Amino acid sequence: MQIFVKTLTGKTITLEVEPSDTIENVKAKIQDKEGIPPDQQRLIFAGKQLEDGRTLSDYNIQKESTLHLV
Ligand SMILES: [Zn+2]
Ligand SMILES: [Zn+2]
Ligand SMILES: [Zn+2]
Numbered sequence: 001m002q003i004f005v006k007t008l009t010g011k012t013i014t015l016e017v018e019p020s021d022t023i024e025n026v027k028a029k030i031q032d033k034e035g036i037p038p039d040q041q042r043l044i045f046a047g048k049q050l051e052d053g054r055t056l057s058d059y060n061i062q063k064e065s066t067l068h069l070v
Pocket of ligand 1: 018
């Protein structure tokens with residue numbers, strides 16, 4: 001499936017993922033896209049701070065959903 005991530009510069013990046021992908025997996029994809037080390041990444045979805053060990057599905061993150069990097 002596909003989700004979007006807003007960077008600290010307002011840039012929108014597109015990620016191909018799956019419902020079971022963990023937030024840690026997503027941070028690795030963001031690192032590849034933008035070069036940001038995972039430990040410097042903090043993600044938010046619908047006002048929820050996302051934990052590395054939980055999955056997109058766990059957070060109700062759907063197709064075409066947008067996540068925020070802070
Ligand atoms: Zn798979
Ligand atoms: Zn995956
Ligand atoms: Zn926003």
